[PDB]
C-alpha cells in the first residue's frame, strides 16, 4: 500500500462552467396550428415529455444571476427570430405622402385632445398611371406636423417602416431551453434563494421549465412567482445605478381593455401587397383603461415594504413616486394586449408612503401603432388595427424599481419604477439555471497493474 499507480477512468461525474450555444424547443401547443399561422411555431424541436430529473444531494454549486451566460444570448435569439418574421411582409415605402388631415368630429373638451386624426391622402393603385385618394384614421402619436395642417408619420424620415403580416399573432408562446448532448442544466431548489453564491440542494435537468418572453418594461406581466418569501433580488443594493428586481408571491390580477370598435379596411398599394388601415369607427368612443383590485394591490405593497425594510434597517421611511422622465415607453409601462401595444400610464399605483409604525383602481391608457421596440436604429414596424373590442387579463408578478441617489443620510429612501431595458424582464426567469459542461475522463491514483 505504498506504490502510487496512475489510472484514468472514463465517465467520471465531474463538470465545469462553460459558455455554449443552447438549443430551443417548442411545445405541442404551438404545433397544434401549423403552416406558420402563429409565432415561432416551426423553428424548434418538439419537447420530450416526462424528463429524467434526479434530485441531487451533497452538492454545493454557486450561481450568479448577473454574471451568467444563457441570458445575454436568449435576447439575441429572440430578436433574431423577431426580425426574421418581417422579411416576407409588406413594406410601406410609397406611403409617406403629405396627409391632408383633420380632427374627428367628436364631442371633445379643451383638455381632452382628439385622440383620432382623420387623414386623407393619395396612393398608387395597380395601374401605375392612375392615383387614388383614400382616407383613414391615425392615433395622435403617429402624425407630426410639417406646416388643414399637413401631417406625416413620425418615423418615416427616421427609417423605412415595415408592416407586420396579419397572419402572425404577437402573443407569447411557451418555450423550452434544452442543452446539446454533453451539457447539463443545474437548477437548485432552495426556497430562500438570494440568487448569488452557493445554493444548498441542486438537480441536473436536460431542459428548462416553461419560459415565455413577454415585452413589458415595468410590472412584468404573466410571469413566474416565488415560493414562500416576497424576494428582493439584487444583492448589491447600496449602489443606486443598478435596478432592483422584486418578485412577490401572490399574483395581482391586472385586468385591462380597449372598448372601441375598430373597423379594418384594405387598400391596394401594389401588385401583391395590401395596406391595412383603420376604417370608420362605429359605436361609442372611449379611453382604453386598466383596473387593479385595490385591496390586493395595497396588501402586496405592504408586503414589499416589509421585506425591503430588512435591507435598510428596521426604523426607516419608504415612499414611492411615479416615473420622472424618459421616452413614452419607459415613462410608463408598455404591454402587448391582443396583438397591439398599450402605453398605459402607472401613476395611480406607486404613490404610498409607509411610516415605520372593492373600489377598483383605474388607470388610463394611450394607444400607439408604429413601434421602435428594442430601439433598433433603423427599424420601425406598423401594427395593423385589430377589429372590435379588445381585452386581456394578466398576472402582475413583480416590480422593477430604482433607488434615489439621496445624499447625506436620506431616511425617506424614495423608490421609482424604473423600466430599463427588456433584459431584466427575462433575468427574473433564468436566475435558477446554470449551464455546466460535463468533463469526463477523470484521473486518479490507486494501486493496480496491467500484467501480460
Amino acid at each position, epitope marked *: 500500500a505504498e506504490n502510487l499507480w496512475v489510472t484514468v477512468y472514463y465517465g467520471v461525474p465531474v463538470w465545469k462552467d462553460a459558455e455554449t450555444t443552447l438549443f430551443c424547443a417548442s411545445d405541442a401547443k404551438a404545433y397544434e396550428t401549423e403552416k406558420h399561422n402563429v409565432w415561432a411555431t416551426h423553428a424548434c424541436v418538439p419537447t420530450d415529455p416526462n424528463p429524467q430529473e434526479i434530485h441531487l444531494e451533497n452538492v454545493t454549486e454557486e450561481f450568479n444571476m448577473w454574471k451568467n451566460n444563457m441570458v445575454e444570448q436568449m435576447h439575441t435569439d429572440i430578436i433574431s427570430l423577431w426580425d426574421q418574421s418581417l422579411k416576407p411582409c409588406v413594406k410601406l415605402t410609397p406611403l409617406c405622402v403629405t396627409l391632408q388631415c383633420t380632427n374627428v368630429t367628436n364631442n371633445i373638451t379643451d383638455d381632452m385632445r382628439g385622440e383620432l386624426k382623420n387623414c386623407s391622402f393619395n396612393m398608387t393603385t395597380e395601374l401605375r398611371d392612375k392615383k387614388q385618394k383614400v382616407y383613414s384614421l391615425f392615433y395622435r402619436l403617429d402624425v407630426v406636423q410639417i406646416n388643414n395642417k399637413e401631417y406625416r408619420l413620425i418615423n418615416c424620415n427616421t427609417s423605412a417602416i415595415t408592416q407586420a403580416c396579419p397572419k402572425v399573432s404577437f402573443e407569447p408562446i411557451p418555450i423550452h431551453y434544452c442543452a446539446p448532448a454533453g451539457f447539463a442544466i443545474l437548477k437548485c431548489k432552495d426556497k430562500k434563494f438570494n440568487g448569488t453564491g452557493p445554493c444548498p440542494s441542486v438537480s441536473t435537468v436536460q431542459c428548462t421549465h416553461g419560459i415565455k418572453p413577454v415585452v413589458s418594461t415595468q410590472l412584468l406581466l404573466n410571469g413566474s412567482l416565488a415560493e414562500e418569501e416576497v424576494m428582493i433580488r439584487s444583492e448589491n443594493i*447600496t449602489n*443606486n*445605478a443598478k435596478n432592483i428586481l422584486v418578485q412577490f408571491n401572490t399574483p395581482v390580477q391586472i385586468n385591462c381593455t380597449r372598448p372601441n370598435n375598430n373597423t379594418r379596411k384594405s387598400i391596394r398599394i401594389g401588385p401583391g401587397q395590401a395596406f391595412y388601415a383603420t376604417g370608420d369607427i362605429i359605436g361609442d368612443i372611449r379611453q382604453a383603461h386598466c383596473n387593479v383590485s385595490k385591496a390586493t394591490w395595497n396588501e402586496t405593497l405592504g408586503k414589499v415594504v416589509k421585506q425591503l425594510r430588512k435591507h435598510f434597517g428596521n426604523n426607516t421611511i419608504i415612499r414611492f413616486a411615479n416615473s*420622472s422622465g424618459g421616452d413614452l415607453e419607459v415613462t410608463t409601462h408598455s404591454f402587448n394586449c391582443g396583438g397591439e401595444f398599450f402605453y398605459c400610464n402607472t401613476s395611480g399605483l406607486f404613490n404610498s408612503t409607509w411610516i415605520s409604525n372593492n373600489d377598483s383602481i383605474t388607470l388610463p391608457c394611450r394607444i400607439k401603432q408604429i413601434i421602435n421596440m428594442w430601439q433598433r436604429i*433603423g427599424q420601425a414596424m406598423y401594427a395593423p388595427p385589430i377589429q372590435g373590442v379588445i381585452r386581456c387579463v394578466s398576472n402582475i408578478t413583480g416590480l422593477i424599481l430604482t433607488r434615489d*441617489g439621496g445624499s447625506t443620510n436620506s431616511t425617506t429612501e424614495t423608490f421609482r419604477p424604473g423600466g430599463g*431595458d427588456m433584459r431584466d424582464n427575462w433575468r427574473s426567469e433564468l436566475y435558477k439555471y446554470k449551464v455546466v459542461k460535463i468533463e469526463p475522463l477523470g484521473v486518479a491514483p490507486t494501486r493496480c497493474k496491467r500484467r501480460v
Partner: antibody
Amino acid sequence: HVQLVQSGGGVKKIGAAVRISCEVSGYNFMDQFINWVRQAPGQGLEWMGWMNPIYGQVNYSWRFQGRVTMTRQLSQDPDDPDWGTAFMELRGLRVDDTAVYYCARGPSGENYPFHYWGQGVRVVVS
Amino acid sequence: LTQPASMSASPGQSVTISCSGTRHIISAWFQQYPGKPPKLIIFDDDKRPSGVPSRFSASRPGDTASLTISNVQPEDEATYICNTYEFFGGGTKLTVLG
C-alpha cells in the same frame, strides 16, 4: 479613445433656463450612463443625478426634483451610431448655485466610480 | 464626509490621509488640480491606474479609509476628494513647501 466635450456655460439673470450640452464620441453610446456632477466653489463635490441614453432614464437627487431636465439626443442615421448628446436644462435657479458642471461617466460595463471627467461649463447668476 | 481642510508637508516626507465614515462600502481617492477635472488615482482601495507612482497605497481595516503616500514630490500640491459611491467627501488641500 474616449472623447467627451461640453458647451454652453456663461452668466444668466435669475429666473431663466440654463442649457448645458455634453457631446460624447469615441465609444458606443448605448451604454455608459452620463453622471452630472456639480462643483460649488468653496465646497467638495455634490451630485445632482444621472441619465441613461438607452431610453432617456433619469435619476435625480433629493434636491433638484422639479427643477432639472436631463434630456438626450441619439444618432438618427446608422452612419455614425456612437455620437451622443446629453442635454441638461436647469430652470428657476436660485442665486446660490454659481458653480461648474461636469458630465462624468464610468468604466466598461458599470457606472461607479467616475473615471473620465469633462473640462466643465461654468455658470454664474446675476 | 468630514475631511480635513488643508495640510502642509515637505519633500521626502510620507503622510497618511484618513477618510471617515463610508460605513464599509468601499471608497475611492481622486486627485484634483485647482480648476481642473480630477482623475481617478485610487479605486477599490487596492489598485491604481497606469501612470501613477507606486508611492500611493490605500487600505481600509475598518470604516476609515487610510491612504499613505511616501517621498512626496515637491510639485505634487493638489486637492484630494473622497468618494463613497454617490456622495463626495470634503476634500483636502495638500501643500508641499519648497
